[PDB]
Amino acid sequence: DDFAKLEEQFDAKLGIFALDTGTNRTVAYRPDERFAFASTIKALTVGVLLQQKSIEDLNQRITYTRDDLVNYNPITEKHVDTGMTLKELADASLRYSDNAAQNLILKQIGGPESLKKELRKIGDEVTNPERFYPELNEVNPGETQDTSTARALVTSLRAFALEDKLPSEKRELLIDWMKRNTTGDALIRAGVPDGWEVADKTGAASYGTRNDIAIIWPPKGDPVVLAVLSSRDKKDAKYDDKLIAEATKVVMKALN
Numbered sequence: 001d002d003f004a005k006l007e008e009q010f011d012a013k014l015g016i017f018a019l020d021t022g023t024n025r026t027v028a029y030r031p032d033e034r035f036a037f038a039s040t041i042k043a044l045t046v047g048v049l050l051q052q053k054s055i056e057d058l059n060q061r062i063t064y065t066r067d068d069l070v071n072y073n074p075i076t077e078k079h080v081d082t083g084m085t086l087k088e089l090a091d092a093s094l095r096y097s098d099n100a101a102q103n104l105i106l107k108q109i110g111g112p113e114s115l116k117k118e119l120r121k122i123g124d125e126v127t128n129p130e131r132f133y134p135e136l137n138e139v140n141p142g143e144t145q146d147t148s149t150a151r152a153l154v155t156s157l158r159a160f161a162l163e164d165k166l167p168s169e170k171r172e173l174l175i176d177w178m179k180r181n182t183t184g185d186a187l188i189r190a191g192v193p194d195g196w197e198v199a200d201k202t203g204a205a206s207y208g209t210r211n212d213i214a215i216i217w218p219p220k221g222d223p224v225v226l227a228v229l230s231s232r233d234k235k236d237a238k239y240d241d242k243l244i245a246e247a248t249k250v251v252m253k254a255l256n
C-alpha cells in the first residue's frame with residue numbers, strides 16, 4: 001500500500017520490479033503492466049551494439065548531417081562536421097540521452113526490427129522496439145509499439161550488464177557509462193543512500209511517462225536491478241521525478 005499511496009499522491013500509474021541478485025528476493029507492483037519504454041531502450045540498444053562488435057570496432061567513425069538530428073541532440077548537434085565514433089555515440093546516448101545518438105546506433109544494428117530480433121535472442125519476448133526518434137515518443141494507452149514492462153526491462157538489463165549476454169570487458173563499458181549517467185540525479189539515485197554505486201538510464205515520453213532502470217550496488221553485497229516506470233492519464237501531462245525517488249525508497253525499505 002506504500003506504492004498505491006504514491007499513485008494516490010502523484011496521480012500516476014506506477015510500474016515496479018526489483019530483483020536482489022544476492023537473495024533472488026523480489027519487489028513487485030504492476031510488474032507486467034506495459035509502459036512506453038522511452039529513452040530506457042538506449043541501455044538495451046548499447047547492449048546489442050556491444051554484442052555485435054569488438055571494443056576496437058566501436059572506433060568506427062559515423063558521418064551524419066543535420067537531417068540525422070531530431071528534437072534533442074546535446075552531443076550530436078556539436079559534431080556534424082567531425083562525425084562521432086560508435087563509442088562516442090554510445091557515451092552520448094547513455095550519459096546525456098542524446099536522441100540522435102540512439103537513432104544512429106539503432107541504424108548501425110539495422111533498425112528497430114533488427115533490435116527486436118536481438119532482444120528475442122537474449123530471452124525478451126516483451127520489449128517491442130518499432131520506431132525511431134521522434135515517433136517512438138507517441139504511445140497512446142493500449143498500444144504495444146515501443147513498450148516494455150518493469151519485469152522485462154530488469155531481466156534484460158541484468159542479462160547484458162550482470163550475466164552472459166556480454167563478455168566482462170563489454171559489461172564494464174556498459175556499466176561504466178550507466179554509472180556516469182548525467183540525467184538521473186533526481187530519480188533512482190535520489191532514493192538510494194550516498195556512497196552506493198548506481199548505474200541508470202532515464203526516460204521521459206508522452207502521457208507523462210517517466211522511467212528509470214538501474215543496477216544498485218550496496219557497499220558490500222550483490223547488486224539490486226530495479227525498474228521504476230510511471231505514466232499519467234492525459235497526453236500532455238507533466239511528470240514529477242520525486243515519484244521515482246520515493247518509489248525507489250519504498251523498494252530499498254522492502255529489501256533491507
Ligand SMILES: *C(=O)[C@@H](NC(=O)Cc1cccs1)[C@@H]1NC(C(=O)O)=C(C)CS1
Pocket residue numbers: 038039040071072097099133137183201202203204205206
Ligand atoms: C527519452 O526518454 C528521450 N525523451 C524524448 O526525446 C521525449 C521528450 C522530449 C522533451 C520532453 S519529453 C530523452 N530522454 C530524457 C530522459 O531520459 O530524461 C529526456 C528528459 C528527454 S530527451
